[PDB]
CSV table of C-alpha atoms and ligand atoms in Angstrom, one decimal:
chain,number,residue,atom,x,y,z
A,1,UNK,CA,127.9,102.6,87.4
A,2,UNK,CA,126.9,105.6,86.0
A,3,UNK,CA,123.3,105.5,84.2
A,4,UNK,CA,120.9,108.2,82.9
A,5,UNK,CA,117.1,107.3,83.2
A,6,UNK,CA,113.9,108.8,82.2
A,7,UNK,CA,111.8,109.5,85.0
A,8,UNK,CA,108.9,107.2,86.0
A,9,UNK,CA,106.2,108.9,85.7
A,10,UNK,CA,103.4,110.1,88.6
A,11,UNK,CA,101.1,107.3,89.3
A,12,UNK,CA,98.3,110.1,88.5
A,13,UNK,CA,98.7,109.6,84.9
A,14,UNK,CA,98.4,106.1,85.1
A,15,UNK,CA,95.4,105.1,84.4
A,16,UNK,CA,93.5,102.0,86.5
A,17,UNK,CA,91.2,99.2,84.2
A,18,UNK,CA,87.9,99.8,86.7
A,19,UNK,CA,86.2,96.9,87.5
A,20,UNK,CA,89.1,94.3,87.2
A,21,UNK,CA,88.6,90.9,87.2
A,22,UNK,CA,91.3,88.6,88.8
A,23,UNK,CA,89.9,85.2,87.0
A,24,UNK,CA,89.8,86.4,83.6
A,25,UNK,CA,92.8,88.0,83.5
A,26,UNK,CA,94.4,84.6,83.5
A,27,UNK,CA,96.1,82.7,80.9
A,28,UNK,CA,98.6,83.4,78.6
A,29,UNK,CA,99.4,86.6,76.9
A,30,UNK,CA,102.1,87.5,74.1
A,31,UNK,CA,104.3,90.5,74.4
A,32,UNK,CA,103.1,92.4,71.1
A,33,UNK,CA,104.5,95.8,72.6
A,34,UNK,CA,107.1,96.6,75.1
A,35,UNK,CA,108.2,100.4,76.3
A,36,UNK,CA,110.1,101.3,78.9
A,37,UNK,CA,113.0,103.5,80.6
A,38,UNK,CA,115.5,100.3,79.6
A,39,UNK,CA,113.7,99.2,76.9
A,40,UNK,CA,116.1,100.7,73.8
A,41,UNK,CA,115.3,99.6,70.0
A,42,UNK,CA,118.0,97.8,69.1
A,43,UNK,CA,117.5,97.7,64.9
A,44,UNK,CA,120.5,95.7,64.4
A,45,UNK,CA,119.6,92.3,66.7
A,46,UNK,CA,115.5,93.0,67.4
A,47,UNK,CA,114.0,91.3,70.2
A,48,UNK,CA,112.1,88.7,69.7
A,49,UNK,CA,108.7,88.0,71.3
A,50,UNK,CA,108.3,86.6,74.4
A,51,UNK,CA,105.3,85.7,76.3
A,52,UNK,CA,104.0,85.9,80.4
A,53,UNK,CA,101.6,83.1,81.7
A,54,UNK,CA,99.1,84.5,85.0
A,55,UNK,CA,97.9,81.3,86.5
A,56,UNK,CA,95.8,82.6,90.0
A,57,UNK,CA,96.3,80.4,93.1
A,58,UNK,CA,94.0,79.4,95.4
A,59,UNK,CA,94.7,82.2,97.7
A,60,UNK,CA,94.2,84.9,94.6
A,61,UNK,CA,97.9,85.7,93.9
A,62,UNK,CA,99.4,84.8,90.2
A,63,UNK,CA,101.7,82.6,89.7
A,64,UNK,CA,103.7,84.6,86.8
A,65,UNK,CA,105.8,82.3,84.2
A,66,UNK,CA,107.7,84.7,81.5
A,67,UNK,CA,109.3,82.4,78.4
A,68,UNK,CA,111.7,83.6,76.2
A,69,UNK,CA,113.7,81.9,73.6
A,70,UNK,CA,117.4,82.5,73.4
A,71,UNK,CA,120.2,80.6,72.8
A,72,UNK,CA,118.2,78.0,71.1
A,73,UNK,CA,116.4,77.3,74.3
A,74,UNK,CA,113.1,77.8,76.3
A,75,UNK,CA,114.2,80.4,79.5
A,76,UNK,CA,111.4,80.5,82.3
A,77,UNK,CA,111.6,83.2,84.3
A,78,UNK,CA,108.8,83.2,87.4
A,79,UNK,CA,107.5,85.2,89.9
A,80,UNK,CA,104.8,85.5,92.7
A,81,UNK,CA,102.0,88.6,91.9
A,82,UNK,CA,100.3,89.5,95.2
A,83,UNK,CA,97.3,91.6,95.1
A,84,UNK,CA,97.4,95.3,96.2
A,85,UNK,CA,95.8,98.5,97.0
A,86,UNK,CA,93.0,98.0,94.7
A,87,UNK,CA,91.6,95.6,92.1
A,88,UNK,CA,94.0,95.6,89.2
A,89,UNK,CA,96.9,96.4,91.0
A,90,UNK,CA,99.6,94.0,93.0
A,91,UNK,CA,103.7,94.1,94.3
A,92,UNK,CA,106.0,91.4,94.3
A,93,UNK,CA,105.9,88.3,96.6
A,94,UNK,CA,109.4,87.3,98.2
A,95,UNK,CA,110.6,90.2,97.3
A,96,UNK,CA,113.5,89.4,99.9
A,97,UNK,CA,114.7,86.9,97.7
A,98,UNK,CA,115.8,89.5,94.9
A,99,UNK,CA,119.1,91.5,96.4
A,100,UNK,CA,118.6,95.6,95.8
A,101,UNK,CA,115.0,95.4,95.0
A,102,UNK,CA,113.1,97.3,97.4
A,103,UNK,CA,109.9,98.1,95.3
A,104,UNK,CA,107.9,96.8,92.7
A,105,UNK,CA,104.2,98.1,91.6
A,106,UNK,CA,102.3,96.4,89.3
A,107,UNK,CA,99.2,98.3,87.4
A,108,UNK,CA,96.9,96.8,85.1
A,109,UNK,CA,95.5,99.9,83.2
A,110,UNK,CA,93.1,98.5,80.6
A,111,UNK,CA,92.5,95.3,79.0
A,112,UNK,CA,89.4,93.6,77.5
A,113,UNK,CA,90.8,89.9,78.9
A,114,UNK,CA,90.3,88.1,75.4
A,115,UNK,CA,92.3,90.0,73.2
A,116,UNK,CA,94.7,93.1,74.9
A,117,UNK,CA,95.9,94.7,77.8
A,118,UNK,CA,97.8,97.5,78.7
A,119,UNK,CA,99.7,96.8,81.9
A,120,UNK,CA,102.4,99.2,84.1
A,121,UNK,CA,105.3,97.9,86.0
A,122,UNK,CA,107.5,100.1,88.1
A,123,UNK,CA,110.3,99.2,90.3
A,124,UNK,CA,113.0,100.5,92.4
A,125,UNK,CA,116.3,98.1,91.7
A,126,UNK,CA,120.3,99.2,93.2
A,127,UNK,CA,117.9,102.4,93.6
A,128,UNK,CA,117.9,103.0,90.6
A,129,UNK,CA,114.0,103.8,89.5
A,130,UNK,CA,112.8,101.9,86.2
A,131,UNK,CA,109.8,101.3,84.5
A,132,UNK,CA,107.6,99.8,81.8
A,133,UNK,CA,104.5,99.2,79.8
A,134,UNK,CA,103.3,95.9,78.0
A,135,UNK,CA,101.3,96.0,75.3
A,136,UNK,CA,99.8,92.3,75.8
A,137,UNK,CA,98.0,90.5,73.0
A,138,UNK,CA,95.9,87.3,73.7
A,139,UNK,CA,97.2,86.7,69.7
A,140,UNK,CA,100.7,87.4,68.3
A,141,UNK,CA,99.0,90.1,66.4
A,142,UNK,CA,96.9,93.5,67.2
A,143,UNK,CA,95.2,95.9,65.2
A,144,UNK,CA,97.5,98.9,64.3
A,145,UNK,CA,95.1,100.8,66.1
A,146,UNK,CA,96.1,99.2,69.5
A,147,UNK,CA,99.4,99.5,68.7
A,148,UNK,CA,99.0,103.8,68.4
A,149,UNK,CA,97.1,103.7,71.1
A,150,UNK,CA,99.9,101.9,73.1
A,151,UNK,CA,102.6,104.2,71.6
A,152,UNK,CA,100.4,107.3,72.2
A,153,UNK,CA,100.0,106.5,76.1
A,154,UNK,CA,103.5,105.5,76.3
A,155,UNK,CA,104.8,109.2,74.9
A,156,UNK,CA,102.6,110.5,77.7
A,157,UNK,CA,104.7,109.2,79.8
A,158,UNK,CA,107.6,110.5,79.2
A,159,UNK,CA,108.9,107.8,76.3
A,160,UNK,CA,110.2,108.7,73.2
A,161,UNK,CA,109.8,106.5,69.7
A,162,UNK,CA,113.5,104.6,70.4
A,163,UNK,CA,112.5,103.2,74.2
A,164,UNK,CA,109.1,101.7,72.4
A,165,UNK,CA,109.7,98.4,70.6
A,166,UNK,CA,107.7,95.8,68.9
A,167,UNK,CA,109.0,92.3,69.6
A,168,UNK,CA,108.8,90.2,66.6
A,169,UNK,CA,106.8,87.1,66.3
A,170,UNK,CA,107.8,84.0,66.7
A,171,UNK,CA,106.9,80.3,66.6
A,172,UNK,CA,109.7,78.6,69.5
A,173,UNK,CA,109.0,78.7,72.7
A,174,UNK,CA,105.6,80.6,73.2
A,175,UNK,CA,103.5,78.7,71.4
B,1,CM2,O1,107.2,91.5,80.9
B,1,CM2,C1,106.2,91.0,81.4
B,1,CM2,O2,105.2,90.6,80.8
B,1,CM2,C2,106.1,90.7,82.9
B,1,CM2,C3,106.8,89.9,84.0
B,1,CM2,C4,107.2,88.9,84.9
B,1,CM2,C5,108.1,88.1,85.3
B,1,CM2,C6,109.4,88.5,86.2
B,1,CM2,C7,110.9,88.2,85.4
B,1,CM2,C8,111.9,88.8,86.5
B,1,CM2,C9,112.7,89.9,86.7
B,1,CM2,C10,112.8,91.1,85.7
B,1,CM2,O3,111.9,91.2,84.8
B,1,CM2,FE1,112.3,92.8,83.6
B,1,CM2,O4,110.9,94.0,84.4
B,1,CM2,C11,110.9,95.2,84.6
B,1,CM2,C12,109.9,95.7,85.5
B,1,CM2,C13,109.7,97.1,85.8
B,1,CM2,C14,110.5,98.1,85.1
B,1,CM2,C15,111.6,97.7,84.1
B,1,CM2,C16,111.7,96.2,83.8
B,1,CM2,C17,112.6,95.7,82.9
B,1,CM2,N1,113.1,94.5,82.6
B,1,CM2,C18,114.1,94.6,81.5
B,1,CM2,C19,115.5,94.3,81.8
B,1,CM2,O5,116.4,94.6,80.9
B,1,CM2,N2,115.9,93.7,83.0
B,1,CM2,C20,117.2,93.4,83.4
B,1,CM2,C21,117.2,92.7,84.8
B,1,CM2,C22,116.6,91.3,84.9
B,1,CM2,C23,116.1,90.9,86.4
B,1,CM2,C24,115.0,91.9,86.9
B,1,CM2,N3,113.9,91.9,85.9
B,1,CM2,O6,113.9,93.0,84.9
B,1,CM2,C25,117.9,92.6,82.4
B,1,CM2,O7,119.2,92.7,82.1
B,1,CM2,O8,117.3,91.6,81.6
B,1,CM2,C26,117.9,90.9,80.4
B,1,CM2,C27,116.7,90.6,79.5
B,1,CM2,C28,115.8,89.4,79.9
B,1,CM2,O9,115.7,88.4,79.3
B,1,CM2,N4,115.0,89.6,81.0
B,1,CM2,C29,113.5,89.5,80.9
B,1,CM2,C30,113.0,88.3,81.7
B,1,CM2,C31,111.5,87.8,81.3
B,1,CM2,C32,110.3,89.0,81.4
B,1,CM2,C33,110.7,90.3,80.6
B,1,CM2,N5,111.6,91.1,81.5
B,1,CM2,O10,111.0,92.1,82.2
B,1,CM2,C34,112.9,90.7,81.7
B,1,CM2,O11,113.6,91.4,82.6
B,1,CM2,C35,114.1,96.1,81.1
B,1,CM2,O12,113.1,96.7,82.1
């Protein structure tokens, strides 16, 4: 391996959504915008919509269910989402279980819980360092203003127009 990556960025200019409430957070949101070091556009075969379920447990941490399609079938990908620092913000349970993970941050930095959110991962994986921002949408579709707004924050970081996609809507799977 040999890769090239733009930096993450400082956490300073990340913002945190004050104020965050765990319980209505919940629920299932659609990926309406995805940007990211990895994330590259890919015009030819676009990716397709996906969506990521945060169900809280009794003892406050999500229980996080991604589905894709692919392959004509369903793939559930899941994970545990322990609270951290501050309200808003969490790591990854079990994080033994992955091999040459030794870091994962996750930021939620705004969101009005019944329509978007804006929410900040960034991990360290082989040591390489990634990262990435979802534009979540409580509907399949968001004003186009939300959608500048997502790709403006998303250049301050650092990303340029080819690492910030748009999945594509669709009816398998997520609904
Ligand atoms: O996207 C969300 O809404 C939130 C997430 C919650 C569930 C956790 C799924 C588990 C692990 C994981 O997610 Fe992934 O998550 C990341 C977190 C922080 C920084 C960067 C990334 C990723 N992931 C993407 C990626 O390409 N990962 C690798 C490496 C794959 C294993 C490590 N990654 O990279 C890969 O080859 O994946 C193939 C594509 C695929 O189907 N994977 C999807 C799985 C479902 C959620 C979307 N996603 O985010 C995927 O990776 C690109 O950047």
């Amino acid at each position: 391996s040999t890769s090239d990556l733009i930096p993450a960025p400082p956490l300073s200019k990340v913002p945190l959504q004050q104020n965050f409430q765990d319980n209505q957070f919940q629920g299932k949101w659609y990926v309406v915008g995805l940007a990211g070091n990895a994330i590259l556009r890919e015009d030819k075969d676009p990716q397709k919509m996906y969506a990521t379920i945060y169900e809280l447990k009794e003892d406050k941490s999500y229980n996080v269910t991604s589905v894709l399609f692919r392959k004509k079938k369903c793939d559930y990908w899941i994970r545990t989402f322990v609270p951290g620092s501050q309200p808003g913000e969490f790591t990854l349970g079990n994080i033994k279980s992955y091999p040459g993970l030794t870091s994962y941050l996750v930021r939620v930095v705004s969101t009005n819980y019944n329509q978007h959110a804006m929410v900040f991962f960034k991990k360290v994986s082989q040591n390489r360092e990634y990262f990435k921002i979802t534009l979540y949408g409580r509907t399949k579709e968001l004003t186009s203003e939300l959608k500048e707004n997502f790709i403006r924050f998303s250049k301050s970081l650092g990303l340029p127009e080819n690492h910030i996609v748009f999945p594509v809507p669709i009816d398998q799977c997520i609904d």
